[PDB]
Amino acid sequence: LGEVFVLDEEEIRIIQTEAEGIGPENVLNASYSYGATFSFQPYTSIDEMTYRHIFTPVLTISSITPDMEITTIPKGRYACIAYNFSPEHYFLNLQKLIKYIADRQLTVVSDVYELIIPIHYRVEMKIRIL
Amino acid sequence: LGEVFVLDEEEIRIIQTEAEGIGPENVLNASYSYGATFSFQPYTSIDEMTYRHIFTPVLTISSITPDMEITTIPKGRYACIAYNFSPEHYFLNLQKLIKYIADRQLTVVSDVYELIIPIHYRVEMKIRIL
Ligand SMILES: c1ccc([P+](c2ccccc2)(c2ccccc2)c2ccccc2)cc1
Ligand SMILES: c1ccc([P+](c2ccccc2)(c2ccccc2)c2ccccc2)cc1
Ligand SMILES: [Mn+2]
C-alpha cells in the first residue's frame, strides 16, 4: 500500500480518445474514473511527461463515434503501484516504478497506465511486463 | 478464402504511432508487414474512411521513443476475412464484414484491424467480437 507489486490482472475494456498533447502538468494548473497513458520513458519532469491517450472504462451493443476507440487493458502481468493522490507523490511514485523496473531488469511491454478513481481520489500506475 | 470466418486468435505484440489523418485513399494515389486501424463505422466511401493508428509487429528489452507505443492485438475472438490485394476488393471486402456483423447481430469490441503482408500483397481485416 504505497509500494510496488506484481500481479496477473484481468482485461478491462475501456474507451479512448487522444490527449492533444495536454500534459500532467497542464492538468494541475489554470482555473476551469478515467485514466490516461504515456511512454515508459526514463522520465525527469512533469514538464517532460506528456499524456498520449485519455480514457474511461466501460460500464455498458454500441455507444460511440470514430473519434473514440473501443479497446481494453490487456490481461497480463503488470508491475503495479497504488497511492492516495497528492502532487508531491505523483512524480515521486513514478520514480519508484521506473526504479523497480531497472532494478529487477524486467522488460516492459506497454505504455504506463494511470488510473484515477474519485474516492469521494485513489490512483495507480501499472505497466505491462513479462 | 475470400469470405469471413470466426476464430480465437493469439495476441500479437506490435508497435505503433499515429495516422495523422492520412486515409486509405490517400495511400492509393500520388507519386512517392504492417497494418493500420480505424473506427468500425457503418462506412460508405474510402473518402470517408480515415486511418487512426499505423503499425508494425514485433520481431525483437527495448527499442523505442515516446512517439511510439509498445502494445499488441489482444488475444480474443475476431471475425476475420482474408483477400489477395486489389482495390475494387478493398472496399468491397469491408462491406461483407460489416454486413456479416449486422446479420449475425454480434457485438464488436475494437477498431478494425488492417493487416498487409507483402507476399513478394496479402491482406486481412479482423475485428474483435464477443
Ligand atoms: C483533457 C481533458 C480532461 C482530462 P482529465 C484527466 C487528467 C489526468 C489524467 C487522466 C485524465 C481531468 C482530471 C482532473 C481534473 C480535470 C480534468 C479527465 C477526462 C475525462 C474524464 C475524467 C477526467 C485530461 C485531459
Ligand atoms: C503513412 C505512411 C505510410 C503508410 P503505409 C500503410 C498504408 C495503409 C495501411 C497501413 C500502412 C504504406 C503502404 C503502402 C505504400 C506506401 C505506404 C506503411 C507504413 C509503415 C510500414 C509499412 C507501410 C501509411 C500512412
Ligand atoms: Mn492514438
Curated annotation (Swiss-Prot), chains A, B:
Keyword Disulfide bond: no
GO biological process, one term: regulation of DNA-templated transcription
Keywords on record: Activator, DNA-binding, Transcription, Transcription regulation
Coiled coil: none
Sample GO molecular function, one term: DNA-binding transcription factor activity
Keyword Transcription regulation: yes
Quaternary state and interactors: Binds DNA as a homodimer.
Function per UniProt: Activates transcription of the bmr gene in response to structurally dissimilar drugs. Binds rhodamine as an inducer.
Protein name: Multidrug-efflux transporter 1 regulator
Organism from which the protein derives: Bacillus subtilis (strain 168)
Location of this fragment in the whole protein: 121 to 277 of 278
